[PDB]
Amino acid sequence: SVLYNSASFSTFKCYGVSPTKLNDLCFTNVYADSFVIRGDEVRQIAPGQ
Amino acid sequence: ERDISTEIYQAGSTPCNGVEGFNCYFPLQSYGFQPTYGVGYQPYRVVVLS
């Protein structure tokens, strides 16, 4: 309900896998990260970059 | 079936009516393929004779 279509929380800059169909597939282990932005805006977060 | 009809897809909060960027995309983009590249990637002649 508040995962993807929250519409009021923040941005969701993501890529690669479908941001809608993953709601059905079930995983075993889910990782959580508490870190800080890379430094400029988001820029250097990109494959091949 | 032909697919001539073109229209910008809308699944988020943005209709993407010429406002590309900031979580907004446009399917048609320029590839920028210079000649001296991986000729193995070159498109081939595909024909179907039903």
Side-chain angles (χ1 to χ4, degrees):
Chain A
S1 176
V2 299
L3 181 55
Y4 184 77
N5 197 357
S6 66
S8 162
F9 203 74
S10 177
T11 178
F12 195 65
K13 293 182 176 67
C14 198
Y15 46 87
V17 298
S18 65
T20 79
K21 198 54 189 67
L22 77 164
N23 183 57
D24 293 332
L25 190 65
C26 308
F27 321 112
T28 68
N29 299 341
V30 170
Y31 282 0
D33 300 338
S34 277
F35 68 108
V36 66
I37 197 61
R38 316 282 202 193
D40 293 329
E41 295 80 15
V42 70
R43 288 200 299 264
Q44 49 190 354
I45 307 170
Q49 289 272 89
Chain B
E1 189 177 6
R2 225 171 186 167
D3 54 353
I4 303 295
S5 43
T6 186
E7 60 87 20
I8 188 66
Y9 184 64
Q10 192 270 332
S13 297
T14 69
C16 282
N17 197 3
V19 69
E20 55 92 26
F22 180 49
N23 299 337
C24 170
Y25 289 101
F26 179 55
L28 185 63
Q29 75 169 122
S30 291
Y31 296 166
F33 278 135
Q34 277 81 18
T36 311
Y37 287 167
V39 292
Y41 292 75
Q42 285 178 354
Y44 280 20
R45 281 154 65 92
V46 169
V47 179
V48 181
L49 313 183
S50 282

Coordinates of all heavy atoms in Angstrom, one line a residue:
Chain A
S1 N 0.8 -1.2 0.0 CA 0.0 0.0 0.0 C 0.9 1.3 0.0 O 0.5 2.2 -0.7 CB -0.9 0.0 1.2 OG -1.7 1.2 1.3
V2 N 1.9 1.3 0.8 CA 2.9 2.4 0.8 C 4.2 2.0 0.3 O 5.2 2.8 0.5 CB 3.0 2.9 2.3 CG1 1.6 3.4 2.8 CG2 3.5 1.9 3.2
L3 N 4.3 0.9 -0.4 CA 5.6 0.5 -0.9 C 6.0 1.3 -2.2 O 7.1 2.0 -2.1 CB 5.6 -1.0 -1.3 CG 6.9 -1.6 -1.9 CD1 8.1 -1.3 -0.9 CD2 6.7 -3.0 -2.2
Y4 N 5.2 1.3 -3.2 CA 5.5 2.0 -4.5 C 4.6 3.2 -4.7 O 5.1 4.3 -5.0 CB 5.4 1.0 -5.6 CG 5.8 1.6 -7.0 CD1 7.2 1.8 -7.3 CD2 4.9 2.0 -7.9 CE1 7.5 2.4 -8.5 CE2 5.2 2.5 -9.1 CZ 6.6 2.7 -9.4 OH 6.9 3.3 -10.6
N5 N 3.3 3.0 -4.7 CA 2.3 4.0 -5.0 C 1.9 4.8 -3.7 O 0.8 5.0 -3.4 CB 1.1 3.5 -5.7 CG 0.3 4.5 -6.4 OD1 0.6 5.7 -6.3 ND2 -0.8 4.1 -7.0
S6 N 3.0 5.3 -3.0 CA 2.7 6.1 -1.8 C 2.2 7.5 -2.2 O 1.4 8.1 -1.6 CB 3.9 6.1 -0.9 OG 5.0 6.8 -1.6
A7 N 2.8 8.0 -3.3 CA 2.5 9.3 -3.9 C 2.8 10.5 -3.1 O 2.5 11.6 -3.6 CB 1.0 9.3 -4.4
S8 N 3.2 10.3 -1.8 CA 3.5 11.5 -1.0 C 4.7 11.4 -0.1 O 5.0 12.3 0.7 CB 2.3 11.7 0.0 OG 2.6 12.5 1.1
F9 N 5.6 10.3 -0.3 CA 6.7 10.2 0.6 C 8.0 10.8 0.0 O 8.5 11.7 0.6 CB 6.9 8.7 0.9 CG 7.6 8.4 2.2 CD1 7.0 8.6 3.4 CD2 8.9 7.9 2.2 CE1 7.6 8.3 4.6 CE2 9.6 7.7 3.3 CZ 8.9 7.9 4.6
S10 N 8.4 10.3 -1.1 CA 9.7 10.7 -1.7 C 9.8 10.1 -3.1 O 8.9 9.5 -3.6 CB 10.9 10.2 -0.8 OG 12.1 10.6 -1.4
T11 N 11.0 10.3 -3.7 CA 11.3 9.7 -5.0 C 11.6 8.2 -4.8 O 11.9 7.7 -3.8 CB 12.5 10.5 -5.6 OG1 12.8 9.9 -6.9 CG2 13.7 10.4 -4.7
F12 N 11.6 7.6 -6.0 CA 11.8 6.1 -6.1 C 12.8 5.8 -7.2 O 12.5 5.0 -8.1 CB 10.5 5.3 -6.2 CG 10.7 3.9 -5.9 CD1 11.1 3.4 -4.6 CD2 10.5 2.9 -6.9 CE1 11.2 2.1 -4.4 CE2 10.6 1.6 -6.6 CZ 11.0 1.2 -5.4
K13 N 13.9 6.5 -7.3 CA 14.8 6.3 -8.4 C 15.4 4.9 -8.4 O 16.2 4.5 -7.6 CB 16.0 7.3 -8.3 CG 15.6 8.8 -8.5 CD 16.8 9.7 -8.4 CE 16.5 11.1 -8.7 NZ 15.6 11.7 -7.6
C14 N 14.8 4.1 -9.3 CA 15.2 2.7 -9.4 C 15.1 2.2 -10.8 O 14.5 2.9 -11.7 CB 14.2 1.8 -8.5 SG 14.9 0.2 -8.1
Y15 N 15.7 1.1 -11.1 CA 15.8 0.6 -12.5 C 16.0 -0.9 -12.5 O 16.0 -1.5 -11.4 CB 16.9 1.4 -13.2 CG 18.2 1.4 -12.4 CD1 19.1 0.4 -12.5 CD2 18.5 2.5 -11.6 CE1 20.3 0.4 -11.7 CE2 19.7 2.6 -10.9 CZ 20.6 1.5 -10.9 OH 21.7 1.6 -10.2
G16 N 16.1 -1.4 -13.7 CA 16.4 -2.9 -13.8 C 15.3 -3.8 -13.8 O 14.9 -4.4 -14.9
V17 N 14.6 -4.0 -12.7 CA 13.5 -4.9 -12.6 C 12.2 -4.1 -12.6 O 12.2 -2.9 -12.4 CB 13.6 -5.8 -11.3 CG1 14.8 -6.7 -11.3 CG2 13.6 -4.9 -10.1
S18 N 11.1 -4.8 -12.9 CA 9.8 -4.2 -13.0 C 9.4 -3.7 -11.7 O 9.3 -4.4 -10.7 CB 8.8 -5.2 -13.6 OG 8.6 -6.2 -12.6
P19 N 9.1 -2.4 -11.5 CA 8.7 -1.8 -10.2 C 7.2 -2.2 -9.9 O 6.7 -1.7 -8.8 CB 8.8 -0.3 -10.5 CG 8.6 -0.1 -11.9 CD 9.2 -1.3 -12.6
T20 N 6.5 -3.0 -10.6 CA 5.2 -3.4 -10.4 C 5.0 -4.9 -10.2 O 4.2 -5.3 -9.4 CB 4.2 -2.9 -11.5 OG1 4.3 -3.7 -12.6 CG2 4.6 -1.4 -11.9
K21 N 5.6 -5.7 -11.0 CA 5.4 -7.1 -11.0 C 6.1 -7.8 -9.8 O 5.8 -9.0 -9.5 CB 5.8 -7.7 -12.3 CG 5.3 -9.1 -12.6 CD 3.8 -9.2 -12.4 CE 3.2 -10.6 -12.5 NZ 3.6 -11.4 -11.3
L22 N 7.1 -7.2 -9.2 CA 7.8 -7.8 -8.1 C 6.9 -8.0 -6.9 O 7.3 -8.7 -5.9 CB 9.0 -6.9 -7.7 CG 8.7 -5.7 -6.8 CD1 10.0 -5.2 -6.2 CD2 8.1 -4.6 -7.7
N23 N 5.7 -7.4 -6.8 CA 4.8 -7.5 -5.7 C 4.3 -8.9 -5.6 O 3.8 -9.3 -4.5 CB 3.7 -6.5 -5.9 CG 2.7 -6.6 -4.7 OD1 3.1 -6.4 -3.5 ND2 1.4 -6.8 -5.0
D24 N 4.4 -9.7 -6.6 CA 3.9 -11.1 -6.6 C 5.0 -12.1 -6.1 O 4.7 -13.0 -5.3 CB 3.3 -11.5 -7.9 CG 2.1 -10.7 -8.3 OD1 1.3 -10.3 -7.4 OD2 1.8 -10.6 -9.5
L25 N 6.2 -12.0 -6.7 CA 7.2 -12.9 -6.4 C 7.7 -12.8 -4.9 O 7.7 -11.7 -4.4 CB 8.4 -12.7 -7.3 CG 9.5 -13.7 -7.3 CD1 9.0 -15.0 -7.8 CD2 10.7 -13.2 -8.1
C26 N 7.9 -14.0 -4.4 CA 8.3 -14.1 -3.0 C 9.8 -14.5 -2.8 O 10.3 -15.3 -3.6 CB 7.5 -15.1 -2.2 SG 5.7 -14.9 -2.4
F27 N 10.5 -13.8 -1.9 CA 11.9 -14.0 -1.7 C 12.2 -14.7 -0.3 O 11.3 -14.8 0.5 CB 12.7 -12.7 -1.8 CG 12.2 -11.8 -2.9 CD1 11.6 -10.6 -2.6 CD2 12.4 -12.2 -4.2 CE1 11.1 -9.8 -3.6 CE2 11.9 -11.3 -5.2 CZ 11.3 -10.1 -4.9
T28 N 13.4 -15.1 -0.1 CA 13.8 -15.7 1.1 C 14.4 -14.7 2.1 O 13.9 -14.5 3.2 CB 14.8 -16.9 0.9 OG1 16.0 -16.3 0.4 CG2 14.3 -17.8 -0.2
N29 N 15.5 -14.1 1.7 CA 16.2 -13.1 2.5 C 16.0 -11.7 1.9 O 16.2 -11.5 0.7 CB 17.7 -13.5 2.6 CG 17.9 -14.9 3.2 OD1 17.0 -15.4 3.9 ND2 19.0 -15.4 3.0
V30 N 15.7 -10.7 2.8 CA 15.5 -9.4 2.4 C 16.6 -8.5 3.2 O 16.7 -8.6 4.4 CB 14.1 -8.8 2.7 CG1 14.1 -7.3 2.5 CG2 13.1 -9.5 1.8
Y31 N 17.4 -7.8 2.4 CA 18.5 -7.0 3.0 C 18.0 -5.6 3.2 O 17.3 -5.0 2.5 CB 19.7 -7.0 2.0 CG 20.5 -8.3 2.1 CD1 20.1 -9.3 2.9 CD2 21.6 -8.4 1.3 CE1 20.9 -10.5 3.0 CE2 22.4 -9.5 1.3 CZ 22.0 -10.6 2.2 OH 22.8 -11.7 2.2
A32 N 18.5 -5.0 4.3 CA 18.2 -3.6 4.7 C 19.5 -2.9 4.9 O 20.5 -3.4 5.5 CB 17.4 -3.6 6.0
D33 N 19.6 -1.7 4.3 CA 20.8 -0.9 4.3 C 20.5 0.5 4.9 O 19.5 1.1 4.5 CB 21.4 -0.7 2.9 CG 21.8 -2.0 2.3 OD1 22.0 -3.0 3.0 OD2 21.8 -2.1 1.0
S34 N 21.3 0.9 5.9 CA 21.3 2.3 6.5 C 22.6 3.0 6.2 O 23.5 2.9 7.0 CB 21.0 2.2 7.9 OG 19.6 2.0 8.2
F35 N 22.6 3.7 5.1 CA 23.8 4.4 4.7 C 23.5 5.8 4.1 O 22.3 6.3 4.3 CB 24.6 3.6 3.6 CG 24.0 3.4 2.3 CD1 24.4 4.1 1.2 CD2 22.8 2.6 2.2 CE1 23.8 4.0 0.0 CE2 22.2 2.5 0.9 CZ 22.7 3.2 -0.2
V36 N 24.4 6.5 3.5 CA 24.3 7.8 3.1 C 24.5 7.9 1.6 O 25.1 7.1 1.0 CB 25.3 8.8 3.9 CG1 26.7 8.4 3.5 CG2 25.0 10.2 3.6
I37 N 24.0 9.0 1.0 CA 24.1 9.2 -0.5 C 25.5 9.2 -0.9 O 26.5 9.6 -0.1 CB 23.3 10.5 -0.9 CG1 23.1 10.5 -2.4 CG2 24.1 11.7 -0.5 CD1 22.2 9.3 -2.8
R38 N 25.8 8.9 -2.2 CA 27.1 8.8 -2.7 C 27.8 10.1 -2.7 O 29.1 10.2 -2.6 CB 27.1 8.2 -4.1 CG 26.2 7.0 -4.2 CD 26.8 5.7 -3.6 NE 26.2 4.5 -4.2 CZ 26.4 3.3 -3.7 NH1 27.2 3.1 -2.6 NH2 25.8 2.2 -4.3
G39 N 27.1 11.2 -2.8 CA 27.7 12.5 -2.6 C 27.3 13.7 -3.5 O 27.3 14.8 -3.0
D40 N 27.0 13.5 -4.8 CA 26.7 14.7 -5.6 C 25.2 15.0 -5.7 O 24.8 16.0 -5.1 CB 27.3 14.4 -7.0 CG 28.8 14.4 -7.0 OD1 29.4 15.1 -6.2 OD2 29.4 13.7 -7.9
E41 N 24.5 14.2 -6.4 CA 23.0 14.1 -6.1 C 22.6 12.7 -5.9 O 22.3 12.2 -4.8 CB 22.2 14.8 -7.2 CG 22.4 16.3 -7.3 CD 23.7 16.6 -8.1 OE1 24.2 15.7 -8.8 OE2 24.1 17.8 -8.0
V42 N 22.6 11.9 -7.0 CA 22.5 10.5 -7.1 C 23.4 10.0 -8.2 O 23.6 8.7 -8.3 CB 21.0 10.1 -7.4 CG1 20.7 10.4 -8.8 CG2 20.8 8.6 -7.1
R43 N 24.1 10.9 -8.8 CA 24.6 10.7 -10.2 C 25.3 9.4 -10.4 O 25.0 8.6 -11.3 CB 25.4 11.9 -10.6 CG 24.7 13.2 -10.9 CD 25.5 14.1 -11.8 NE 26.7 14.5 -11.2 CZ 26.9 15.6 -10.4 NH1 25.9 16.5 -10.3 NH2 28.1 15.9 -9.9
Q44 N 26.3 9.1 -9.5 CA 27.2 8.0 -9.8 C 26.6 6.6 -9.4 O 27.3 5.6 -9.3 CB 28.5 8.2 -9.0 CG 28.4 8.6 -7.6 CD 29.7 9.0 -6.9 OE1 30.7 8.9 -7.6 NE2 29.6 9.5 -5.7
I45 N 25.2 6.6 -9.3 CA 24.5 5.3 -9.1 C 23.9 5.0 -10.5 O 22.8 5.3 -10.8 CB 23.5 5.4 -8.0 CG1 24.1 5.9 -6.7 CG2 22.8 4.0 -7.8 CD1 23.1 6.2 -5.6
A46 N 24.7 4.2 -11.3 CA 24.2 3.8 -12.6 C 25.2 2.7 -13.1 O 26.4 2.8 -13.1 CB 24.2 4.9 -13.6
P47 N 24.6 1.6 -13.6 CA 25.5 0.6 -14.2 C 26.2 1.1 -15.5 O 25.6 1.9 -16.2 CB 24.5 -0.5 -14.6 CG 23.2 0.1 -14.7 CD 23.2 1.2 -13.7
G48 N 27.4 0.7 -15.6 CA 28.3 1.2 -16.7 C 28.7 2.7 -16.5 O 29.4 3.2 -17.4
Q49 N 28.5 3.2 -15.3 CA 28.9 4.6 -15.0 C 29.9 4.5 -13.8 O 29.6 3.8 -12.8 CB 27.7 5.5 -14.6 CG 26.9 5.8 -15.8 CD 27.4 7.1 -16.5 OE1 28.2 7.0 -17.4 NE2 26.9 8.2 -16.1
Chain B
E1 N -0.8 -8.2 -36.3 CA -1.5 -6.9 -36.1 C -0.5 -5.7 -36.1 O 0.5 -5.8 -35.4 CB -2.3 -6.9 -34.8 CG -3.3 -5.7 -34.6 CD -4.1 -5.8 -33.4 OE1 -3.9 -6.8 -32.6 OE2 -5.0 -5.0 -33.2
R2 N -0.9 -4.7 -36.8 CA -0.1 -3.5 -36.8 C -0.2 -2.7 -35.5 O -1.1 -2.9 -34.8 CB -0.5 -2.6 -38.0 CG 0.7 -2.0 -38.8 CD 0.2 -1.3 -40.1 NE 1.3 -0.9 -40.9 CZ 1.1 -0.5 -42.2 NH1 -0.1 -0.5 -42.7 NH2 2.1 -0.2 -42.9
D3 N 0.8 -1.9 -35.2 CA 0.9 -1.1 -34.0 C 1.3 0.4 -34.3 O 2.2 0.9 -33.7 CB 1.9 -1.7 -33.0 CG 3.3 -1.9 -33.7 OD1 3.4 -1.7 -34.9 OD2 4.2 -2.3 -32.9
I4 N 0.6 0.9 -35.3 CA 0.9 2.3 -35.7 C 0.6 3.3 -34.6 O 1.4 4.2 -34.4 CB 0.1 2.7 -37.0 CG1 0.4 1.6 -38.1 CG2 0.4 4.1 -37.5 CD1 1.8 1.7 -38.6
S5 N -0.5 3.1 -33.9 CA -0.9 4.0 -32.9 C 0.2 4.2 -31.8 O 0.6 3.2 -31.2 CB -2.2 3.6 -32.2 OG -2.2 2.2 -32.0
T6 N 0.6 5.4 -31.5 CA 1.7 5.7 -30.5 C 1.1 6.7 -29.5 O 0.4 7.6 -29.9 CB 2.9 6.2 -31.2 OG1 4.0 6.4 -30.2 CG2 2.7 7.6 -31.9
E7 N 1.4 6.4 -28.2 CA 1.0 7.3 -27.1 C 1.8 7.0 -25.9 O 2.3 5.9 -25.7 CB -0.5 7.0 -26.8 CG -0.9 5.6 -26.4 CD -0.7 5.4 -24.9 OE1 -0.7 6.4 -24.2 OE2 -0.6 4.2 -24.5
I8 N 2.1 8.0 -25.2 CA 3.0 7.9 -24.0 C 2.3 7.1 -22.9 O 1.2 7.4 -22.5 CB 3.4 9.3 -23.5 CG1 4.5 9.2 -22.5 CG2 2.2 10.2 -23.0 CD1 5.8 8.6 -23.0
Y9 N 3.0 6.1 -22.4 CA 2.5 5.3 -21.4 C 2.5 6.0 -20.0 O 3.4 6.8 -19.7 CB 3.3 4.0 -21.2 CG 2.7 3.0 -20.2 CD1 1.5 2.4 -20.4 CD2 3.5 2.7 -19.1 CE1 1.0 1.5 -19.5 CE2 2.9 1.8 -18.2 CZ 1.7 1.2 -18.4 OH 1.2 0.3 -17.4
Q10 N 1.4 5.8 -19.3 CA 1.2 6.5 -18.0 C 0.9 5.4 -16.9 O -0.2 4.8 -17.0 CB 0.1 7.5 -18.1 CG 0.1 8.5 -16.9 CD -0.8 8.0 -15.8 OE1 -1.8 7.2 -16.0 NE2 -0.5 8.3 -14.5
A11 N 1.8 5.2 -16.0 CA 1.6 4.3 -14.8 C 1.9 5.0 -13.5 O 1.5 4.4 -12.5 CB 2.4 3.1 -15.0
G12 N 2.6 6.1 -13.5 CA 2.8 6.8 -12.3 C 2.0 8.1 -12.1 O 0.9 8.2 -12.7
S13 N 2.5 9.0 -11.3 CA 1.8 10.3 -11.1 C 2.0 11.3 -12.2 O 1.4 12.4 -12.2 CB 2.3 10.9 -9.8 OG 1.9 10.1 -8.7
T14 N 2.9 11.0 -13.2 CA 3.2 11.9 -14.2 C 2.7 11.4 -15.6 O 2.9 10.3 -15.9 CB 4.8 12.1 -14.4 OG1 5.3 10.9 -14.8 CG2 5.4 12.4 -13.0
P15 N 1.9 12.3 -16.3 CA 1.5 11.9 -17.6 C 2.6 12.0 -18.7 O 2.4 11.5 -19.8 CB 0.4 12.9 -17.9 CG 0.7 14.1 -17.1 CD 1.5 13.6 -15.9
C16 N 3.7 12.6 -18.4 CA 4.9 12.6 -19.3 C 4.5 13.3 -20.6 O 4.8 12.8 -21.7 CB 5.5 11.2 -19.5 SG 6.5 10.7 -18.1
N17 N 3.8 14.4 -20.5 CA 3.4 15.1 -21.7 C 4.5 16.2 -22.0 O 4.3 17.4 -21.9 CB 2.0 15.8 -21.6 CG 1.4 16.2 -22.9 OD1 2.0 16.0 -23.9 ND2 0.3 16.8 -22.8
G18 N 5.6 15.7 -22.5 CA 6.8 16.6 -22.8 C 7.5 17.0 -21.6 O 8.2 18.0 -21.7
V19 N 7.4 16.3 -20.5 CA 8.1 16.7 -19.2 C 9.1 15.6 -18.8 O 9.3 15.4 -17.6 CB 7.0 16.9 -18.1 CG1 6.3 15.6 -17.7 CG2 7.6 17.7 -16.9
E20 N 9.7 15.1 -19.8 CA 10.7 13.9 -19.6 C 11.8 14.3 -18.6 O 12.3 15.5 -18.6 CB 11.3 13.5 -20.9 CG 12.0 14.6 -21.7 CD 13.5 14.7 -21.4 OE1 14.1 13.7 -20.9 OE2 14.0 15.8 -21.5
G21 N 12.1 13.4 -17.7 CA 13.0 13.6 -16.6 C 12.2 13.7 -15.3 O 11.0 13.8 -15.2
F22 N 13.0 13.4 -14.2 CA 12.5 13.4 -12.8 C 11.4 12.3 -12.8 O 10.2 12.5 -12.5 CB 11.9 14.7 -12.4 CG 11.4 14.7 -11.0 CD1 12.1 14.2 -9.9 CD2 10.1 15.3 -10.7 CE1 11.6 14.2 -8.7 CE2 9.6 15.3 -9.5 CZ 10.4 14.7 -8.4
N23 N 11.9 11.0 -12.9 CA 11.0 9.8 -13.0 C 10.0 9.9 -14.0 O 8.8 9.7 -13.8 CB 10.4 9.6 -11.6 CG 11.4 9.4 -10.5 OD1 12.6 9.0 -10.8 ND2 11.1 9.6 -9.2
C24 N 10.4 10.2 -15.3 CA 9.5 10.3 -16.4 C 10.4 9.9 -17.6 O 11.5 10.4 -17.8 CB 8.9 11.7 -16.6 SG 8.1 12.0 -18.1
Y25 N 9.8 9.1 -18.5 CA 10.5 8.5 -19.6 C 9.7 8.7 -20.9 O 8.5 8.9 -20.9 CB 10.9 7.1 -19.4 CG 11.9 6.9 -18.3 CD1 11.6 6.5 -17.0 CD2 13.3 7.1 -18.6 CE1 12.5 6.3 -16.1 CE2 14.2 6.9 -17.6 CZ 13.9 6.5 -16.4 OH 14.8 6.3 -15.4
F26 N 10.4 8.6 -22.0 CA 9.9 8.6 -23.4 C 10.5 7.4 -24.1 O 11.7 7.3 -24.3 CB 10.1 9.9 -24.1 CG 9.6 10.0 -25.5 CD1 8.3 9.7 -25.8 CD2 10.5 10.3 -26.5 CE1 7.8 9.8 -27.1 CE2 10.0 10.4 -27.8 CZ 8.7 10.2 -28.1
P27 N 9.6 6.5 -24.7 CA 10.2 5.3 -25.3 C 11.2 5.5 -26.4 O 12.2 4.8 -26.5 CB 9.0 4.5 -25.7 CG 7.8 5.5 -25.7 CD 8.2 6.5 -24.7
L28 N 10.9 6.5 -27.2 CA 11.7 6.7 -28.4 C 13.0 7.5 -28.0 O 12.9 8.6 -27.5 CB 10.9 7.5 -29.5 CG 11.6 7.7 -30.8 CD1 11.9 6.3 -31.5 CD2 10.7 8.5 -31.8
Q29 N 14.2 7.0 -28.3 CA 15.4 7.6 -28.0 C 16.4 7.4 -29.1 O 16.3 6.4 -29.9 CB 16.0 7.1 -26.7 CG 16.6 5.7 -26.7 CD 17.3 5.4 -25.4 OE1 17.0 4.4 -24.8 NE2 18.3 6.2 -25.1
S30 N 17.4 8.3 -29.2 CA 18.5 8.2 -30.2 C 19.6 7.3 -29.8 O 20.1 7.4 -28.7 CB 19.0 9.6 -30.5 OG 18.1 10.4 -31.2
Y31 N 19.9 6.3 -30.6 CA 20.9 5.3 -30.2 C 22.3 5.8 -30.3 O 23.2 5.4 -29.5 CB 20.8 4.0 -31.1 CG 19.4 3.3 -30.9 CD1 19.0 2.3 -31.8 CD2 18.6 3.6 -29.8 CE1 17.8 1.7 -31.6 CE2 17.4 3.0 -29.6 CZ 17.0 2.0 -30.5 OH 15.8 1.4 -30.3
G32 N 22.6 6.7 -31.3 CA 23.9 7.2 -31.5 C 25.0 6.2 -31.9 O 26.1 6.2 -31.3
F33 N 24.6 5.4 -32.8 CA 25.5 4.3 -33.3 C 26.5 4.8 -34.3 O 26.2 5.1 -35.4 CB 24.7 3.1 -33.8 CG 24.2 2.2 -32.8 CD1 22.9 1.8 -32.9 CD2 24.9 1.8 -31.7 CE1 22.3 0.9 -31.9 CE2 24.4 0.9 -30.8 CZ 23.1 0.5 -30.9
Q34 N 27.8 5.1 -33.8 CA 28.8 5.4 -34.8 C 29.2 4.2 -35.6 O 28.9 3.0 -35.2 CB 30.1 5.9 -34.0 CG 30.0 7.3 -33.6 CD 29.2 7.6 -32.4 OE1 28.9 6.7 -31.6 NE2 28.8 8.8 -32.2
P35 N 29.8 4.4 -36.8 CA 30.0 3.2 -37.7 C 31.0 2.2 -37.1 O 30.6 1.0 -37.1 CB 30.7 3.9 -38.9 CG 30.2 5.3 -38.9 CD 30.0 5.7 -37.5
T36 N 32.1 2.6 -36.6 CA 33.2 1.6 -36.2 C 32.8 1.1 -34.8 O 33.5 1.4 -33.8 CB 34.5 2.3 -36.3 OG1 34.7 3.0 -37.5 CG2 35.6 1.3 -36.1
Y37 N 31.8 0.2 -34.8 CA 31.4 -0.4 -33.6 C 31.2 -1.9 -33.9 O 31.7 -2.5 -34.9 CB 30.1 0.2 -33.1 CG 30.1 1.5 -32.4 CD1 29.0 2.3 -32.2 CD2 31.4 2.1 -32.0 CE1 29.1 3.5 -31.5 CE2 31.4 3.3 -31.4 CZ 30.3 4.0 -31.2 OH 30.4 5.2 -30.6
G38 N 30.6 -2.6 -33.0 CA 30.5 -4.1 -33.0 C 29.6 -4.6 -34.0 O 28.4 -5.0 -33.7
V39 N 30.1 -4.7 -35.3 CA 29.4 -5.1 -36.4 C 28.5 -6.4 -36.2 O 27.5 -6.6 -36.8 CB 30.3 -5.4 -37.6 CG1 30.9 -4.0 -38.1 CG2 31.4 -6.3 -37.2
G40 N 28.9 -7.2 -35.2 CA 28.1 -8.3 -34.8 C 26.7 -7.9 -34.2 O 25.8 -8.7 -34.3
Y41 N 26.6 -6.7 -33.8 CA 25.4 -6.1 -33.3 C 24.5 -5.5 -34.4 O 23.4 -5.0 -34.2 CB 25.6 -5.0 -32.2 CG 26.2 -5.5 -30.9 CD1 27.5 -5.9 -30.8 CD2 25.3 -5.6 -29.8 CE1 28.0 -6.4 -29.6 CE2 25.8 -6.1 -28.6 CZ 27.2 -6.5 -28.5 OH 27.7 -6.9 -27.3
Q42 N 25.0 -5.5 -35.7 CA 24.3 -4.9 -36.8 C 23.0 -5.6 -37.0 O 22.9 -6.8 -37.0 CB 25.2 -4.9 -38.0 CG 26.3 -3.9 -38.0 CD 27.1 -3.9 -39.3 OE1 26.9 -4.8 -40.1 NE2 28.0 -3.0 -39.5
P43 N 21.9 -4.9 -37.3 CA 20.6 -5.5 -37.6 C 20.7 -6.3 -39.0 O 21.5 -5.9 -39.9 CB 19.7 -4.4 -37.7 CG 20.5 -3.2 -38.0 CD 21.8 -3.4 -37.3
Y44 N 19.9 -7.3 -39.1 CA 19.9 -8.2 -40.2 C 18.6 -8.1 -41.0 O 17.6 -7.6 -40.4 CB 20.1 -9.7 -39.8 CG 21.6 -10.0 -39.6 CD1 22.5 -9.1 -39.3 CD2 22.0 -11.4 -39.6 CE1 23.9 -9.4 -39.1 CE2 23.3 -11.7 -39.4 CZ 24.2 -10.7 -39.1 OH 25.6 -11.1 -38.9
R45 N 18.6 -8.6 -42.2 CA 17.4 -8.6 -43.0 C 16.5 -9.8 -42.7 O 16.9 -10.9 -42.9 CB 17.8 -8.6 -44.5 CG 18.2 -7.3 -45.1 CD 19.2 -7.5 -46.3 NE 18.5 -8.1 -47.4 CZ 17.9 -7.4 -48.4 NH1 17.9 -6.1 -48.4 NH2 17.4 -8.1 -49.4
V46 N 15.3 -9.5 -42.1 CA 14.4 -10.5 -41.6 C 13.1 -10.3 -42.5 O 12.5 -9.3 -42.5 CB 14.1 -10.3 -40.1 CG1 12.9 -11.2 -39.8 CG2 15.3 -10.7 -39.3
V47 N 12.7 -11.4 -43.1 CA 11.5 -11.5 -44.0 C 10.7 -12.7 -43.6 O 11.2 -13.7 -43.2 CB 11.9 -11.5 -45.5 CG1 10.6 -11.6 -46.3 CG2 12.7 -10.3 -45.8
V48 N 9.4 -12.6 -43.6 CA 8.4 -13.6 -43.3 C 7.5 -13.9 -44.5 O 6.8 -12.9 -44.9 CB 7.6 -13.4 -42.0 CG1 6.7 -14.5 -41.7 CG2 8.6 -13.1 -40.9
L49 N 7.5 -15.1 -45.0 CA 6.7 -15.4 -46.2 C 5.6 -16.4 -45.7 O 5.7 -17.6 -45.8 CB 7.6 -16.1 -47.3 CG 8.9 -15.4 -47.7 CD1 9.5 -16.2 -48.8 CD2 8.7 -14.0 -48.0
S50 N 4.5 -15.8 -45.2 CA 3.4 -16.6 -44.8 C 2.7 -17.3 -46.0 O 2.7 -16.8 -47.1 CB 2.4 -15.8 -44.0 OG 2.8 -15.5 -42.7

